[PDB]
Nucleic acid binder design. Structure first.
Ligand SMILES: [Mg+2]
Ligand SMILES: [Mg+2]
Ligand SMILES: [Mg+2]
Length: 458
RNA sequence: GGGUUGGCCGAGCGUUGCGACGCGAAAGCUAGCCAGAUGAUUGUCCCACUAGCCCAACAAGCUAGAACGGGACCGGUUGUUCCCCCAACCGUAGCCUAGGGAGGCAUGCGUGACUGGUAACGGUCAGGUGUGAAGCCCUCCCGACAAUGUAGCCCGAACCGCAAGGUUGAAGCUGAAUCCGUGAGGAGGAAGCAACUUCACCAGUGUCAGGUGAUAGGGAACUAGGCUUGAGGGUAUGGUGAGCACAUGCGAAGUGAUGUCAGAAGCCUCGUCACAGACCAACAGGCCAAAGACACUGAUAGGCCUGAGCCAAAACGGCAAAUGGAUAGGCUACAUCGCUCGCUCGUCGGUGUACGGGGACGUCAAUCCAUCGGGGCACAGUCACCACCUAACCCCUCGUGUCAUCUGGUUGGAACGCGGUAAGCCCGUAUCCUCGCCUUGAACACUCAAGGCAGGCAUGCUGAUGGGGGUGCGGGUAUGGGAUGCAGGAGAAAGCGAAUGCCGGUCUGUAAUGGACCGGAUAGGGGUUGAGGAGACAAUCCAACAUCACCCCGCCCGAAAGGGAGCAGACUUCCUGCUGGUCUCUCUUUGCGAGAUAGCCUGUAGAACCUCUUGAAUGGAGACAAGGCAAAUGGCAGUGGAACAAACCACUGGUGCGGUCACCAACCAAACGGCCGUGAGGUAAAGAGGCUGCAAGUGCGUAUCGCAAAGGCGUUCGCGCCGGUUCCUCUUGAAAGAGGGGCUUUGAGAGGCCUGAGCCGGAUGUGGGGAAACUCACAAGUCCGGUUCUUAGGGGGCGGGGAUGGCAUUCGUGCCUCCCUGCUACCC
C-alpha cells in the first residue's frame, strides 16, 4: 500500500541517520561510515525516499531504452522491492536532443526510471560525507549556500586596504569523461562495487564537469557531487606549499579564482595547481587563464570586480546585461502582435530573475539605463501597430498613471464586480538593495550543533 | 555609490454606396481638334500715338482707348546685423479652381401607416439619421478674404482691501481726424478690442523688497493657390530601363559588386565607470558668521559652494572635458535629415550649394563638421557602369500674339441613360404515371384515425378527410473586380434577305491579344390595315423583309392549354465528363549515429543461500576493535522528559561473516590399577545437487530508438566547385563562425481545398506631384493580353440602427456598456 507510509517521519529518520554518519566521520574512524551507509542504503524507509524523489521533479515520463515508465500510484510498490545490490546491471542511455528556441540542441542522456532510483538512492549516504570533507571556501551544489556568498567572500578577502593586488582567473577544460576511471575507484567512499559496475557502461559523456544549466539536473543526482569530491582539497595543498604570500581561494562549483600577493607568486601557483590536476586527468587551458591586476578586473560568475582609486565595488558585468537585452528583444519579436496582456505577462517574470540575481550589489544606477532601454522598446512597439494614428492617441491608449510618474505601461481595466483593476510592468529598480549576511565558513548543515543556522536562516 | 522623476512635430492618399454585356435610337456629361463671338492682357504721371471732333480742316484744345515707344517717379521682395547708393523680378485689373453656407433630388439603414394579390412576392406618402466622390448630382450664395495646425519665438504683470472691483500696464490687432505731395504714396496714431490660471524657488529660521524657473492659455510670422507673348536647336545639378526568388533562376523584359536578424546603408545618444538633468540624504576637502532690511536660535552649534575633477571664494564665478579642426551675423531660393511601409503636404530646427558697393556695431558657442571607440533603431536595400526620353533656368535663331469663356460643326468613350426573364429557385394550376404504409373509428391488421411514420410542419396542428413523382403551362424572384483549363447539353438579348457575327482562303507585326482584302452559305403558305415614304396634285403597292402590325391551313411536339421554325447568338446562371495544383494523415523504403532484455553455451565464488554425504570435525548466551567483506536488515530497538505513562520532545545503537577474547552444555584420539574407576585433549575437516552472482562468447549491429529523403555547373573526359543532410572536434553568452570523418538519396494509399496581392504592353477616361519626361492613387482605374506570388489562425481599425441611460459637464457635447449590425483592403 503506497498511500500508507508517513512522510512526516521519513525526512526525520533519514536526517538522523545522516547526522550519525556525519558525526562519525568527524572522528577519524572511517570504518563506521561503511556500516551506517551500508545500513541506510539496504533498508526500507530510505529506499522509498529515492522513488519519491525520482517520480517528481519531472523526468519520470520519458524512459531510457526500457519502455517501462512508472507514472502511476500503484506500480511504484514492487519497484521498491526490486532494488538490490546483488544482481545489478545498467541499461545504457538513449541520446535525446532537447529542443531549444535558438535550436541549441543540448545532448542530455537519460537513464531508466528504475536505474535513476539507484543514482538517487546512493546520493544519500554519500551526501553527508561530501559536506563534512568540503573545502570550507567551496560553493556550488551544496546545502544551504547561495551563489551570492561567492561575492560575499570578496568584500572581505579583497575589500580592505592592502589585502592582495593580483588575481588569477583560471578555467578547467576537461569533460566528465576525461576523469581517470581508475582514480574514481579509490577515493569516493560510496561503494567499491556499484561504482565499478556504473562506469564501463555509460553514465558519462553527459556534459562537462557540472551541468550546463544552473538549476536543472534533469536525471542525474550523482554527477554534480562526484565533481565536488574529485576537485576537493586544493586548499590545504595550496596553503601548505606557499606559506605567507597572502594566498586565498574561492570556487563556485567551477569558476575558481586565486588571489596572489605579487606576479612572482602567481607563477608557481599555476604550477602547484598544475600538479594537482594530473592525478585526475583534467588540466587547465593555456588560452583563458590570465593573471590580472586588480585595477583592471575580471569576470567572475555573473559579476565584475574592480578597484577605483582606493575603493572596492562589484557591479553587474558587461556580458551579462547584454544578455538581458537579448532575451527581451527576442520576446518582443515572437510576440509582436500579442494582446497587451501577453506582453506584460511574458515580460514580468523575465524582469524578476535578473533583479533577484543582482539584488545584493551596487546596481541602483545599473537598474536605470536598463529600464529606459526597454522603455524605448515598448513605446517603439506601440507605434508600430498603429501606423496611422497620432502620438497623443497611442499614448492615452497604452500608458497609465498610478499616483506617481504619470507615464507607466499598463492598462487600467476593471473586473467583474465593478472594481478598478491594474496591471503594470515591474520597472526594475523598485527593489530595496540588501547587503547580504555571509555564511560562516566552517558551517556544516549536517553536524548536530549549528542547527539554528540554515533552516532558520532560510 | 543610498532615495524619486523624464520620455511625445501635425494632416490627407493607400480601407465601405454603383462596377456584367448590347446601344447613343432621344436628352444630359465630357476629350480633342475646325471656324467665329465676347472679355482680359495687372502701380502713377510726363513724351507720345489712336482715331474722332469740326477744336474750321492746327501749328486745334477736348472727350476718351489700346499686352508689346521713350523718360521721371511711388510701394513691396532678394542680394547674410543696421544705415546710405546701385542693379534684378514682381503689383491695386479680368477669369477659374481649393474651402465654407442655403435648398431640391436619387440612394443606405431601420420605425410607423394605407393598401396590390390565391401566395408566393410586392407597392404609396409622411416621419430620423448616414452618403452624394481621384471614375458616378442640379440651381443659388459667398469665394484667396477665411477655419484649421505646430517642434521654433514672445506675453502669460503691478495694483489696493475695496466684499474683488476698479486703476492700470499689457505681449498685439483694428486703426479716424491732421498735414505734405498733382498722383501712386509718405510723417502723425483720436477712438476702441484683448488671454492675463497654476506653482516651484532665490546661505537655514519667522520676517519685507527686489529677482529667477516651468506650465493653463493668448499673440506675431507662415499656413493662403493659377494662368494673362510663342516655335525651333544644344545643353542635366530632373527621371526611367518590371516583378519575385536564390546554391543553381522564372520571365520578353539592363551588365556588375555587396547585403538579409550576432544585420549592409541611414539615423538618435554618450566618451573609455561611456542616457539629459535636478532635489534630499550621507562622507571628504574648503568658505562666510547669517552673505540685500529685523528680535529668534549658533560657534566641540550653522549654513553654503565644490566633489565618481579641479581651482577659487560670496564673482557675470574659471579650467579641460576620446584625438584632430572650421566659424560671424539668414522670417531667402534649392536639395537633404530630424532613431525605418510607398506618396503628397504645414510650422520648426543643422548641415551642403548659390547669394552687389561703402560705412557702422563688434565675434566663441561645451554650436558645428571629420576620425576612433561603447550602447541602441528593422516592413531589405544600398553603390558604381552603360543606353534612352525630357529642357523650367542657360546660350543661338525665327516670331506677333497669349489666356479664359460662349456658340456652331466633326470624330469618340463611359461605373452616367435606355433594352433583355432564361435554363436555377418560389408559388399557382392542369394532367398523368401513380403506390409506397408502424399501429389504426375498421369489412377481422382491407376504405369514416389518433399516438402520431413520412410529407406539410415548433408531440406544436391537418395528417389513406392521404402520400410520391417527373411533365406541360401561368405569375414572381437572380444580382453579377481576374485566381487549372478544356469539350458537349438545357437557354439564347442585339444584328442579317446579305452583316461589324459565323465558315474557307491571301497577306502582314507584336512575347501575346491584331489590321486590310476575296469567296462561301443564310428563312412554308393564304386574308384586313396603311403607322410613314412613293405613286406627287385624284389616277399604285407597300397588301407589309415598316426583322416579319394582325387572323386561317399544313408542318413538329402536347390529354387538352397552344408552343415552336433560316446561319449568329454577347454577359450572368443550373448540368454533364476529362483535366490541375495545392494541403493534412496513416504505411514502406534506404542513407546516417545510438542500441539492450529474453534464451543458449564457455570458466569461475558461495563466509555471509539451502539440501546433503561423510562420525563429529557441535549447540548456546556474551566482551572488546576495526580506511577487510556481504544474499531480508533502523516501517527497528533503547533511556530520560508529555513524572513515567496516549500521541508529543531530546539523546543512544556496527546489521551479519571474518580478528582478538574469554563462559556453559557431550566428547575420550589423552593418562590407561584391560576396563572393574579416577583426572583431561579437542571440539579441527573434505567431496556431492540445485540455487544464485562475476568475467566471457553466441543470440545481432536484431528489436527499439533521434534527425533526415535537394541537388546544380563542365565531364580538364579523373572529377572539380557550389549546396543539402547526418556524426565528432576548439570558440564566445549567444541561432553566428571554423576544422574534420560519412551519404548526397524510394514507392504507394486515405481524407481536404480552389481565396487574394501586385507588376508589364497598348486602347479609353480622371485626380494629386511636376515646367516636360515620369511619378503615386482610382477594386490590379475599366477591358483585353502576357506573368510571379497567396489560401487553419489570430491582433487591431472602422460603419449603420436601437435601449435603460452611468459618468464628465456646455447641459446636452463626448468617454462608457448591450446586443443587433454590415466592413478587412491592414500586421504576424
Ligand atoms: Mg487600395
Ligand atoms: Mg462595363
Ligand atoms: Mg487587392
Amino acid at each position: 500500500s503506497w498511500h500508507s507510509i508517513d512522510w512526516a517521519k521519513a525526512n526525520r529518520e533519514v536526517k538522523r541517520l545522516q547526522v550519525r554518519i556525519a558525526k562519525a566521520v568527524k572522528e577519524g574512524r572511517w570504518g563506521k561510515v561503511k556500516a551506517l551507509q551500508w545500513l541506510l542504503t539496504h533498508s526500507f524507509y530510505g529506499k522509498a525516499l529515492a522513488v519519491k524523489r525520482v517520480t517528481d521533479n519531472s523526468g519520470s515520463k520519458t524512459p531510457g531504452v526500457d519502455g517501462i515508465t512508472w507514472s502511476t500510484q500503484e506500480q511504484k510498490a514492487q519497484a521498491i522491492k526490486s532494488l538490490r545490490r546483488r544482481g545489478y546491471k545498467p541499461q545504457p542511455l538513449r541520446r535525446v536532443y532537447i529542443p531549444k528556441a535558438s535550436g541549441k540542441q543540448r545532448p542530455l542522456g537519460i537513464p531508466t526510471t528504475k536505474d535513476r532510483a539507484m543514482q538517487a538512492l546512493y546520493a544519500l549516504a554519500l551526501e553527508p560525507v561530501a559536506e563534512t570533507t568540503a573545502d570550507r571556501n567551496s560553493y556550488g551544489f551544496r546545502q544551504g549556500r547561495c551563489t551570492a556568498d561567492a561575492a560575499g567572500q570578496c568584500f572581505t578577502v579583497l575589500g580592505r586596504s592592502d589585502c592582495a593586488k593580483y588575481i588569477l582567473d583560471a578555467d578547467i577544460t576537461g569533460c566528465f569523461d576525461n576523469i581517470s576511471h581508475e582514480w574514481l575507484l579509490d577515493n569516493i567512499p560510496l561503494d567499491k562495487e556499484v561504482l565499478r559496475k556504473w562506469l564501463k557502461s555509460g553514465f558519462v559523456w553527459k556534459q562537462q564537469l557540472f551541468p550546463t544549466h544552473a538549476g536543472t539536473p534533469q536525471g542525474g543526482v550523482i554527477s554534480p557531487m562526484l565533481a565536488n569530491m574529485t576537485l576537493d582539497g586544493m586548499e590545504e595543498l595550496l596553503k601548505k606549499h606557499l606559506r605567507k604570500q597572502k594566498v586565498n581561494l574561492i570556487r563556485y562549483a567551477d569558476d575558481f579564482v586565486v588571489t596572489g600577493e605579487s606576479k612572482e607568486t602567481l607563477e608557481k601557483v599555476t604550477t602547484v595547481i598544475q600538479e594537482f590536476l594530473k592525478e585526475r586527468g583534467l588540466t587547465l587551458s593555456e588560452e583563458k587563464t590570465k593573471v590580472v591586476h586588480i585595477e583592471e578586473g575580471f569576470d567572475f560568475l555573473g559579476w565584475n570586480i574592480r578597484k577605483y582609486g582606493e575603493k572596492l565595488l562589484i557591479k553587474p558585468a558587461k556580458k551579462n546585461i547584454k544578455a538581458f537585452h537579448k532575451k527581451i528583444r527576442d520576446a518582443l519579436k515572437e510576440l509582436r502582435t500579442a494582446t497587451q496582456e501577453a506582453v506584460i505577462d511574458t515580460l514580468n517574470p523575465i524582469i524578476k530573475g535578473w533583479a533577484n540575481y543582482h539584488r545584493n550589489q551596487v546596481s541602483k544606477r545599473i537598474f536605470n539605463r536598463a529600464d529606459d532601454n526597454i522603455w524605448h522598446k515598448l513605446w517603439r512597439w506601440a507605434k508600430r501597430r498603429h501606423p496611422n494614428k497620432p502620438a497623443r492617441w497611442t499614448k492615452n491608449k497604452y500608458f497609465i498613471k498610478i499616483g506617481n510618474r504619470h507615464w507607466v505601461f499598463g492598462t487600467w481595466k476593471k473586473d467583474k464586480e465593478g472594481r478598478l483593476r491594474s496591471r503594470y510592468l515591474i520597472k526594475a529598480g523598485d527593489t530595496r538593495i540588501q547587503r547580504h549576511v555571509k555564511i560562516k565558513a566552517d558551517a556544516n548543515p549536517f553536524l548536530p550543533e549549528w542547527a539554528e543556522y540554515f533552516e532558520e536562516r532560510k
